[PDB]
Design a protein around this ligand. Structure first.
Ligand code: CLA
Ligand code: CLA
Ligand code: CLA
Ligand code: CLA
Ligand code: CLA
Ligand code: CLA
Ligand code: CLA
Ligand code: CLA
Ligand SMILES: CC1=C(/C=C/C(C)=C/C=C/C(C)=C/C=C/C=C(C)/C=C/C=C(C)/C=C/C2=C(C)CCCC2(C)C)C(C)(C)CCC1
Ligand SMILES: CC1=C(/C=C/C(C)=C/C=CC(/C)=C/C=C/C=C(C)/C=C\C=C(C)\C=C\C2=C(C)CCCC2(C)C)C(C)(C)CCC1
Ligand SMILES: CCCCCCCCCCCCO[C@@H]1O[C@H](CO)[C@@H](O[C@H]2O[C@H](CO)[C@@H](O)[C@H](O)[C@H]2O)[C@H](O)[C@H]1O
Lengths: 381, 75
């Protein structure tokens, strides 16, 4: 307890598993025909039909989100494990222009090992086109043990995510007033999820990825490269690569930022060695958008007076307060939309799916033309 | 057969011969296979028309069915 918002019932019972259709009143009747079998999976996740309280539906949605995050962590663990056990990642790390990325080998069964093609270096496997190798090279991975460690960490995170979804429903589930705090959610997601996330990744890039990639582009063999923590540990090794790390974190507080202009570059092109974007330019990007997203997260009034109220901003966007040619939306405007979006989960899901699909399309159109990983643009598959 | 040929084994295909239609090809006088059936057998009851010997169609028809260049009873 810390915010006094939980005390959820629905005791973890086992008997409620041998009675399919328990969620719907007509689904728990008694099958009769076969349409029931198909109806079982047609509205299994539709928690809106099952019950009528918005708070119970919100609790169910929150725990379903946690279980989904667990599924995605299991998938990530599997991808890192495939790159750490059934891959030619080290071979590709040595020669990423003549070796074909492969992270899947087929068992020698009926006619089946013909799918294991020669990938260069004597490796008989399937050529993966997921871009995992190019991503791991840019992040800072050099050997497969680091990939195995990341796989174990993702599996641990998956177990942790399936405990957070059981603890936020079967032990201490939030109240509806917590879910309706869109101001706090926007503040935290904008400043703590996106802002601090990209700030932490900029820290990783400045201390792990930029070193490793600079040595890789220089010509150093992958197991001749120091491990990332030495880049973090001693500043002499890191100051050999960059001469702006000799002044430490002093030019930042005294606002002498052009001192840092050799690892926060603003080149804006492609690395000729790798083919990907300039790694220093990437780190500078993440620093700038961290400063932008954190600053954006202090916009909405939460518990301290300062901020906006989205309800006020919505209710004021109306004639005669609009631009004169935009005044056709009338004297009510967006008045009832804050209560639409804080009481309907479907309205929120519609907006978020539209933005998520549009942003995935934007991701597709920005990664062929500005290839953001080493040796990505040349692997056309 | 697709999965055998794709996995580099055209020899492991299941190839079943149409033995009944190959035999009906033989009962008309096709010597393409090793089936000495009715009109393929030159001194058979069907080929000779024993009491009558009036099948005056037999040599002309076997000049055409054995001719492996027309479409009459393709292999
Ligand atoms: C100790 C383990 C445990 C037990 C005994 C229960 C028991 C219960 N839970 Mg549950 N829960 C758990 C863990 C557990 N939970 C965890 C770890 C989470 C976080 C994800 C949840 C989150 C959760 C929610 C949101 C809800 C419940 C509900 C319920 C109750 C109804 C059961 C039911 O719906 O039939 C279902 C029987 C099943 C076998 C469900 C299987 C589905 C799972 C998630 C597997 C699907 C993932 C799939 C494999 C992904 C790959 C897809 C594949 C095709 C590729 C029941 C008493 C529901 C309730 O209260 O009913 C009113 C409710 O809505 N639980
Ligand atoms: C964040 C993503 C998201 C979420 C949470 C939902 C959630 C929901 N959707 Mg939905 N939807 C989505 C994205 C999402 N959708 C997308 C991307 C599409 C376009 C295809 C749809 C189109 C859609 C329709 C048309 C309907 C829903 C419905 C529903 C509700 C019930 C789902 C169900 O029956 O059990 C789960 C169902 C399955 C697991 C079916 C799986 C079989 C698929 C088709 C095969 C997949 C092939 C495989 C990947 C290879 C539920 C609230 C139903 C509803 O009644 O809402 C109230 C409904 O009619 N959705
Ligand atoms: C998205 C998740 C995902 C997918 C699609 C796969 C898919 C596969 N795995 Mg994998 N795996 C995963 C997650 C996944 N795994 C996770 C989270 C772990 C633990 C870290 C593993 C650990 C694992 C091992 C030890 C092996 C596989 C193997 C396999 C292959 C055959 C599995 C089988 O025959 O049964 C197959 C391509 C087998 C393989 O690749 O054969 C050479 C095999 O040896 N997996
Ligand atoms: C049995 C057949 C089989 C299996 C198991 C796999 C499995 C895999 N392939 Mg492969 N592939 C196959 C056939 C198969 N492939 C064939 C015939 C070809 C043509 C030659 C390919 C060509 C191919 C390419 C080019 C690539 C793959 C890749 C992959 C990996 C991607 C994971 C994924 O698909 O998400 C599937 C999503 C799910 C299964 C949803 C469930 C997710 C987990 C299991 C939920 C956890 C459940 C929880 C524990 C409860 C995965 C291990 C990619 C890779 O990067 O390799 C590492 C890659 O780029 N495949
Ligand atoms: C800065 C604090 C903070 C952070 C980091 C998060 C992060 C998250 N929230 Mg949360 N939230 C917060 C405050 C925060 N929230 C507050 C104050 C409220 C009340 C208004 C909420 C209400 C809320 C709801 C209702 C939901 C979320 C959900 C989520 C997850 C979104 C899934 C995703 O997009 O990418 C996933 C990225 C993942 C990076 C990795 C997992 C990170 C773990 C969980 C925490 C990291 C710890 C870090 C060191 C701090 C995500 C992990 C959604 C969810 O998925 O539920 C589980 C969702 O349903 N939040
Ligand atoms: C504008 C935001 C933005 C952009 C352009 C990037 C770009 C990049 N990131 Mg990322 N990142 C971001 C935000 C962003 N990041 C945030 C907020 C986090 C914390 C959650 C991260 C955490 C992160 C990790 C862990 C990693 C990266 C990596 C990368 C590089 C890989 C390619 C890629 O992601 O596709 C390009 C992405 C886009 C085209 C769109 C980004 C989607 C954001 C979330 C939308 C933000 C909305 C904002 C208002 C922008 C305006 C709308 C816009 C879509 C037009 C690339 C240069 C990888 C790397 O190795 O670097 C070399 C890597 O592993 N990032
Ligand atoms: C937010 C994530 C993050 C984290 C965890 C770190 C962590 C660290 N940084 Mg740092 N750094 C970051 C972001 C981050 N940085 C950003 C965004 C910039 C651009 C201004 C820098 C620029 C920077 C410099 C110039 C130096 C550090 C240094 C350090 C190390 C200790 C020195 C110090 O704290 O003062 C330490 C491990 C010092 C170091 O090199 O120690 C190894 C060092 O002098 N950082
Ligand atoms: C109902 C199923 C069925 C149907 C519609 C056909 C239809 C056809 N078959 Mg065929 N056949 C069948 C079953 C069937 N067959 C079975 C089960 C076998 C054994 C593997 C064969 C072996 C076979 C050969 C070798 C040939 C044909 C050929 C043909 C074509 C000419 C007529 C003929 O001789 O067939 C009838 C033959 C039968 C054996 C009748 C089987 C019907 C019974 C009820 C099946 C019961 C299964 C039983 C337990 C075994 C014709 C389109 C000829 C062809 O290719 O044309 C160019 C050809 O020479 N068939
Ligand atoms: C990849 C991956 C993974 C991993 C992850 C990780 C590894 C993590 C992390 C991490 C992180 C994420 C870290 C970070 C951090 C951080 C941050 C975020 C920071 C900050 C800060 C700040 C903001 C500052 C402030 C201040 C100022 C302003 C000045 C004065 C001082 C002070 C302090 C006050 C896993 C395995 C899970 C799974 C798979 C995937
Ligand atoms: C797109 C996508 C994806 C990916 C994702 C990712 C990769 C992500 C994320 C994310 C991230 C990247 C994140 C993050 C985060 C971070 C955070 C959230 C933080 C923080 C903070 C803090 C909490 C800190 C604290 C501290 C400490 C630690 C101590 C000292 C002080 C300080 C303050 C510094 C996938 C494909 C999978 C799927 C689909 C979608
Ligand atoms: C205006 C009234 C019309 C009424 C028509 C009624 C239909 C008439 C049917 C005519 C049928 C002819 O069918 C009969 O076939 C026999 C078959 O051996 C022919 O026989 C033929 O076979 C021998 C082979 O040994 C041939 O070498 C020869 O050219 C010929 O004789 C007869 O010559 C003919 O008489």
């Amino acid at each position: 307890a810390s915010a006094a918002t939980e005390q959820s019932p629905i005791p973890t019972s086992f008997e409620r598993w041998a009675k399919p259709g328990h969620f719907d009143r007509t689904l728990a009747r008694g099958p009769k025909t076969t349409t029931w079998i198909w109806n079982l999976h047609a509205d299994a996740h539709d928690f809106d039909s099952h019950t009528n309280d918005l708070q119970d539906i919100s609790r169910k949605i929150f725990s379903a989100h946690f279980g989904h995050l667990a599924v995605v962590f299991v998938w990530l663990s599997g991808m890192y494990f495939h790159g750490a056990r059934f891959s030619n990642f080290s071979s590709w790390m040595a020669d990423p222009t003549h070796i074909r990325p492969s992270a899947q080998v087929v068992w020698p069964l009926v006619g089946q090992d013909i799918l294991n093609g020669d990938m260069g270096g004597g490796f008989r496997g399937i050529q993966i086109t997921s871009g995992l190798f190019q991503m791991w090279r840019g992040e800072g991975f050099t050997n497969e043990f680091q990939l195995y460690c990341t796989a174990i960490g993702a599996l641990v995170m998956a177990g942790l995510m399936i405990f957070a979804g059981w603890f936020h429903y079967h032990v201490r589930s939030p109240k509806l007033e917590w879910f309706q705090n869109v101001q706090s959610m926007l503040n935290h997601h904008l400043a703590g999820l996106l802002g601090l996330g990209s700030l932490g990744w900029a820290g990783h890039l400045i201390h792990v990825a930029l070193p490793t990639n600079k040595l890789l582009d220089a010509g150093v063999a992958p197991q001749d490269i120091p491990l990332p923590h030495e880049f973090v540990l001693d500043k002499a090794l890191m100051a050999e690569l960059y001469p702006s790390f000799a002044q430490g974190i002093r030019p930042f507080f005294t606002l002498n930022w052009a001192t840092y202009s050799d690892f926060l570059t603003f080149n804006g092109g492609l690395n000729p060695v790798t083919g990907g974007l300039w790694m220093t330019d990437i780190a500078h990007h993440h620093v700038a958008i961290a400063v932008l997203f954190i600053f954006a997260g202090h916009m909405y009034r939460t518990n301290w007076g300062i901020g906006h109220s989205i309800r006020t901003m919505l209710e004021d966007a109306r004639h005669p307060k609009m631009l004169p040619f935009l005044s056709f939306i009338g004297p009510v405007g967006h008045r009832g939309l804050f209560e639409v979006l804080t009481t309907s989960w479907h309205a929120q899901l519609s907006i978020n799916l539209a933005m998520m699909g549009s942003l995935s399309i934007i991701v597709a159109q920005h990664m062929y033309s500005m290839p953001p990983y080493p040796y990505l643009a040349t692997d056309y598959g | 057969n697709d999965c055998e040929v794709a996995f580099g084994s055209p020899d492991k295909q299941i190839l079943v011969e149409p033995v009944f239609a190959q035999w009906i090809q033989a009962v008309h006088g096709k010597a393409l296979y090793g089936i000495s059936s009715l009109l393929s057998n030159p001194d058979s009851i069907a080929s000779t028309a024993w009491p009558n010997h009036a099948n005056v169609w037999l040599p002309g028809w076997l000049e055409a069915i054995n001719n492996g260049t027309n479409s009459l009873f393709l292999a």
